[PDB]
Design a protein around this ligand. Structure first.
Ligand SMILES: [Mg+2]
Ligand SMILES: [Mg+2]
Ligand SMILES: [Mg+2]
Ligand SMILES: [Mg+2]
Ligand SMILES: [Mg+2]
Lengths: 189, 187, 190, 190, 190, 189, 190, 187
């Protein structure tokens, strides 16, 4: 009976949604912890955390058999994964846009932009630790990321989520980093 | 080279959105026209426009491969179709819930509540032209849609959409029709 | 020199916008006024107000020289004008979609849809007076507007804006005018 | 026939909207591409992209016969064009307010204001690479734009839109770039 | 001392608000209690409750020295008082428009309109108990109120508020009560 | 550690909230089913359902050990319990305002008002089944309920939830029922 | 006869409200105008506009005879007046909370809080010019307004409305004016 | 007779609401005043106002017996108190998380984030008057509140309130302070 079909379907969907929440939740805990680690220096720890998070992403990819919902929740989680990943990669010199994950275009671009602000914070801590070279290479990757991401601004911001705004944010932060670098050189006299 | 990949994919999605937009718009125009005819009396042509629409629906059933969109846009047209169909089925005795259209539970359910309103408008017009039989049968079906759909009200609003509110609206229309019918019987 | 230009254009547009605001609001007021004067029985005085409005309309058309501002403000006052005119034509048997003035299409459509409800007012009141004939005619024109209008719901928003909501409004209004027509037929007796 | 005229004009307008939107988009993709090129150095290809865009402005101007939709949708793209142009001029030492385009005054003013931020970014990036010269000339055009622009904010916001905020932003950048300049000066005694 | 004057007046105003609110509340509790009494039949105690309420109107009028807060908050209670009064007058055969209170015109008009629904309720409940008389006299005052009141809706809604809606409601009840009347007539041939 | 305390606390609260949702959910299913039963005639069935529902209310009352949340969700459920109960009681002649449950004043008053619209629907079905006496006694209890509930209008509607509006609704409905009765007598000729 | 009265009062209030709207808006415009004229350097012309405003204010005070309408519209224009005056007094060393005109307390407080941001504008621009003295003065008065105002956050809304929001606004503005002041002290050098 | 009972209970609730309203208002005046003094320099009197406030808090701790309200109104004041307290603790070296106040987890956490802003305002003022030691210690505490509080972000927003957004705000304030401090060191 079509009503019993749609009823069964609805229960499937509900249970689904609940566990999906749980998974995405754990994944985001790992992402975040990872970023805080990198920030505080403990990058091996970070790597391991990220690894856990990717496994969890496999469990997530499992759920796309119900495309209604799923995307209605995943995005956030996904971005931060991307974000955190790029972050390790940047502060390790192994930075690349060649992150081969099962992720949506909007989540990918926004995670990458999200990493910019992270790199500003890092470059600030280094700047204050009187380390100018790390700061400067961070700045280099900030810039790189921005310059390359703008290419996508053309697309309707509905299609690409809140990119344009995010990028303007990034941009202004990049400039602030640069002003700071200069001020740090003068102030290291 | 990835960035080039996610960009090709974006271009796709844009094309697909434009196309789905136009499909669904067409399909709606038909569902709408179908209803307007069922009211106007030309039930045959209603069956026609309806068929055209369902054909367009099977044309919609392609873009599942683009789940990043699809569902989002689809609902309000799917729910529209489900409405018109049910309406026809009630205004030709053949009222059933068991129709297969592969439509999101929400657009299904809500499409059926959505029907009740169109039923009370009909029933009322018939009541004005004397037809108490129409009106009585409609009161039967209307009460059935309500009695049945209410079983799904306990579900999280996030999946069943706003079924409860649509339902209460219907209920009230049912009462107002029962009442409009105890009148008129004063001839 | 460039800036001198765009500056002068600006000052011009400023004074223009002020005046446009005054004239538009006076027009709208006069439109509405006429509509309520009909519902109050002073249909002649209502003709006087509607006249005043249709006059001010001209002075409003004179601001099309400034397509910057002319359009961001057009909508509402003229929606009301269309309403009042639709109504007048309707309560006077010679109702028509053919009203020889444009006036944006959105304003036009929303205006008719908005005159549906004033028609219900007039029809329930005609029902109270006793007169079922005029009541049935008003119910006819109401239904007609609803049908002829629903055809444009296809079009997206932006171009159409109000329509869908205003037509579901007019709809529920039509159901009520009808129910009232039925309970009205207990005469019949008497 | 009133309902049929309106249906016609409706179809026309939606079509026109689709087109205008795509073309505006194009003009914009080139505007942005251009500014990126300037920031890269490739000023030649920059000027080319500008060219393509200003070609597009023709196709766009072709739509001011539908004033509804035209003065709504047009702002962004135009305003950003003016930005690209004014930017490029400023970095070629050939900065002027005497750009001539069929363009809404808001879009114009806002285009210059918007250019100011791009100047500051260029001026910092140079001032990092040492070029104290380029920097100072940039700060110069910056203050220029802010100073002459500020007298247009005696206009009611609705005529002038985001100008205020932009000038606020502008103001800030100016004051900051100054500091940055000075700081690099003492930085490169050593 | 400007900041100190302002704090003073502030404290005064908040206090005045607390008081006005409580007193208005009182006046209202009696207004409602009154209408309930009339619906019960106990017209004596009805008249008493009216008394208590109109006594309260003194304490309330005492606040129009703070026009800020007074003309905002006052509407409901006053309006409902005029309702109770007009209602009781109508059912004592002594219905008049010549209530005299220090009361805002919106509140006044709205009070009469509001009374109309209470009349319809009474008229139905009598017409159920047979009293065809009481019913018909009620319908009479109903039509009176609607008919006189309708000429006030030539006023812009902001001055007149809910009147229109209430008159809408009113109109409805009138037309329906008529029906009901007739239906009971044929009902009690048998 | 105060941080770990507030952490543990937060987990407790979360689990709590989840199961409380489940309970209130089941309760409301029973309420509603009960009302549809009574409407369709099957009042013994209805009784049993209501019984289930009260047991579930015991399980709910269990949770008041976390008064933050709880009330932030219960209300709805509670009202309908009240509503449905009064409803059986009214159509059974055993109507009373003496429903002795562990319920909030606002839930209680609003449930009771909510029952009025139910009784209108009932009295309409009876009216159409040409049964005028049941209609009339229902109308009697509608009226009684209203008349008695108004007494509470005085209280600030924040304190008593959306009572006043609810009562005006009820009122108009009562009048509609009455017009209908009359029209039913004339139309039974 | 009663209705004749409350009718005449109504028509009176209608004309009055129209005229009040015009006068209020003109006043507000003139206030704002003055403020932007100061931020554009034409402080004398700004003196002229602010004069015009303070004059129109009187004609506005003349409408206190109609406490129905006078208060539902008071707020915004006078908030702006208070703003422009506070600002004038502040950019002219002789700043004071003691401005000998009331003017509702809400309008007063919100007005000062809203002048905080115009003060930051003036202070950042003063910082750009080079002048740190006047900058520090402005920063003082800003901070002073913030402190003297926070004292009123206790009071509920209704009486105060805007406050807490506008003060968190002013706050973040003060932090920015400060940060700018610090990076401004790289002169010091030069 | 029940209806009379629930009526008495209502009257109660109204009374309790009025009273709680006034208590919390008083308490917030104090918390606020306390902060304003900590900024102004009168740290002692800040300790005083704070104490009066906490006394009023133990006065608040009665109305638990009226859960139908209480929590609802309390949060924004409780969260306020928690703020002021933490602020004092940081501007006198004695910064700790471990304080007992029996306050809703949300008002606790969000109170501590709330603190960071006041810290950056302080730190900035000190930075203007030359005090780099103040500012540096504040940068330490600020970073600590952020680092620690971020552990609770994974929780449903419905229980932890909007902690994440408040936190990002703070973070940004921390950067802008680090930056404002790399300046000024240019003397
Ligand atoms: Mg981040
Ligand atoms: Mg730019
Ligand atoms: Mg009433
Ligand atoms: Mg119910
Ligand atoms: Mg704070």
């Amino acid at each position: 009976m079509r009503l019993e079909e749609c009823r069964k379907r609805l229960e499937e969907l509900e249970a689904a949604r609940e566990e999906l929440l749980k998974v995405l939740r754990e994944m985001r805990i790992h992402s975040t912890k990872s970023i805080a680690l990198i920030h505080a220096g403990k990058v091996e720890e970070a790597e391991q955390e990220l690894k856990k998070a990717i496994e969890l992403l496999e469990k997530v990819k499992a759920y796309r058999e119900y495309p209604e919902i799923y995307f209605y929740l995943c995005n956030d989680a996904m971005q931060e994964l991307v974000e955190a990943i790029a972050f390790k990669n940047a502060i390790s010199g192994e930075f690349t846009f060649e992150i081969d994950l099962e992720v949506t275009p909007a989540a990918f671009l926004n995670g990458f932009a999200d990493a910019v602000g992270e790199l500003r914070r890092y470059a600030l801590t280094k700047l204050i630790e009187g380390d100018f070279k790390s700061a400067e290479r961070m700045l280099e990757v900030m810039e790189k990321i921005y310059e390359r991401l703008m290419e996508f601004t053309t697309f309707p911001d509905k299609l690409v989520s809140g990119l344009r705004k995010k990028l303007d944010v990034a941009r202004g932060g990049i400039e602030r980093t640069k002003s700071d670098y200069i001020a740090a050189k003068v102030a290291r006299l």
